[PDB]
Amino acid sequence: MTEYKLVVVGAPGVGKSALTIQLIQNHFVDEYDPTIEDSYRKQVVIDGETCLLDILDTAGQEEYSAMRDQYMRTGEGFLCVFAINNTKSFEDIHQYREQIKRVKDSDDVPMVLVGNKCDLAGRTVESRQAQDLARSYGIPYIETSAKTRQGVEDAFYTLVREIRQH
Amino acid sequence: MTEYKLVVVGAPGVGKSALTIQLIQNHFVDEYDPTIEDSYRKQVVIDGETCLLDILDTAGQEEYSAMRDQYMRTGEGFLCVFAINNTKSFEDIHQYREQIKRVKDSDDVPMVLVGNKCDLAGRTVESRQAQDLARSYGIPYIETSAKTRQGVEDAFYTLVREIRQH
Ligand SMILES: Nc1nc2c(ncn2[C@@H]2O[C@H](COP(=O)(O)OP(=O)(O)CP(=O)(O)O)[C@@H](O)[C@H]2O)c(=O)[nH]1
Ligand SMILES: Nc1nc2c(ncn2[C@@H]2O[C@H](COP(=O)(O)OP(=O)(O)CP(=O)(O)O)[C@@H](O)[C@H]2O)c(=O)[nH]1
Ligand SMILES: [Mg+2]
Ligand SMILES: [Mg+2]
Known part of the structure; x- marks a missing residue:
């Protein structure tokens, strides 16, 4: 199957793992539990197609840089996550996007911009400025909460459909 | 607001109304109740943006043709629905798409291809052939059930995001 x-x-800390585990395990993780590298494989049906989601959950620290080019070159689509309560994480997105373009040799790689933690009241990144960013990248923007499970499947399925039209 | x-x-009969009412009224309509023209307006928040969905639910009969160019020229985005148990409805999609391109003067209008009634066991349209169609149109394909509410918000929100990147 596909x-x-x-x-x-x-x-670090934007909710990469919480999003993935919500999708795979249908629960929200509230623990402090830094990722080195985690892999998830799940048979799903998306718009009638039977497919396997092979998900690589990464670390965002500078440690993981070398290890980073390796997994970026084999990824077909990337969820680029920031936290809406964390302006530095929003600004960091540009660093991740430009590393992915570098290793993929491509101006356009299947990508979704994900503003996570949208359940939180103390937002410091406006949805309008994340949406202008995404438009300038020519990619979709999707706001998610791993806590309420808002937008989680939307963020992942949208990425699969981007890969499909590539 | 936007x-x-x-x-x-x-x-006719593909579930245009059932999809719309699921979204707006959060119930599935099982009645035979042909549409002439229905309008729905709903304030929603999609990816943090406060916006108003102004939805025009149409008829698919040849009656409604003249009335059709009128609403196609003012629509910003179109849900093109067929039923997965109805091969003629799938083949009809090409007729609707080409009328919309005609009136919009455009090869690319924001559009989602929606295969409805995906809860039904007796499918006559494979998801693979609807997906090749959609790819040849350069638009997303999304399978929905107005009955189970599977894919309903996905189909509508995806269309809004297509309008946003246009
Ligand atoms: N309220 C709220 N908190 C969230 C959300 N998602 C993640 N968190 C919380 O933020 C913290 C970090 O989550 P985690 O999933 O571990 O993030 P990470 O980005 O994977 C961290 P690392 O980079 O080290 O791998 C946790 O306490 C988690 O419960 C969310 O949508 N809402
Ligand atoms: N099981 C199933 N039946 C559905 C679904 N959506 C619509 N139906 C059924 O199909 C019939 C037609 O639905 P309706 O929403 O009226 O379709 P329409 O395309 O709007 C009809 P018209 O073109 O005349 O306006 C109804 O009996 C409705 O309950 C679906 O996802 N699943
Ligand atoms: Mg993690
Ligand atoms: Mg109707």
Whole structure:
């Protein structure tokens, strides 16, 4: 069956893992539990197609840089996550996007911009400025909460459909 | 606030109304109740943006043709619906798409291809052939059930995001 190699990237603490586990395990993780590298494989049906989601959950620290080019070159689509309560994480997105273009040799790689933690009241990144960013990248923007499970499947399925039209 | 003029089109009986009412009224209509013209307006928040969905639910009969160019020229985005248990409705999609391109003077209008009734076991249209169609149109394909509410918000929100990147 069709397999789709999705990679979840973003600054430390933005909720990369919480999003992935919500999707795979249908629960929200509230623990402090830094990722080195985690892999998830799940048979799903998306718009009638039976496919396997092969998801690589990454670290965002500078440690993981070398290890980073390796997984970026094999990923077919990337979830670029920031936290809406964290302006530095929003600004970091540009760093991840430009590394992915570098290793993929491509101005256009299947990508979704994900503003996570949208359940939180103390937002410091406006949805309008994340939406102008995404438009300038020519990619979709989707706001998610791993807590309420708002937007989680939307963010992942949208990325799969971007890979499909590539 | 931003308003988005969405138009729902497709052959008679495909579930145009059932999709719209699921979204607006959160119930599934099982009655035989042909549409002439229905309008729905709903304030929603999609990816953090406060916007008004202004939805025009249409008829698919040849009656409604003249009335059709009128609403197609004011629509910003179109849901093109067929039924997965109805091969003639799938084949009709080409007729609706080409009328919309005609009136919009455009090879690319924001559009989503929606295969409805995906809860039904007796499918006559494979998801693979609807997906090749959609790719040849350069638009997303999304399978929905107005009955189970599978894919309903996905189909509408995806169309809004297509309008946003246009
Ligand atoms: N309220 C709220 N908190 C969230 C959300 N998603 C993640 N969190 C919280 O933020 C913290 C970090 O989540 P985690 O999933 O571990 O993030 P990470 O980006 O994967 C961290 P690392 O880069 O080290 O791998 C956790 O306490 C988690 O519960 C969300 O949508 N809402
Ligand atoms: N099981 C199933 N039946 C559905 C679904 N959506 C619509 N139907 C059924 O199909 C019939 C037609 O639905 P309706 O929403 O009226 O379709 P329409 O395309 O709007 C009809 P008209 O073109 O005349 O306006 C109804 O009996 C409705 O309950 C669906 O996802 N699943
Ligand atoms: Mg993590
Ligand atoms: Mg109707």
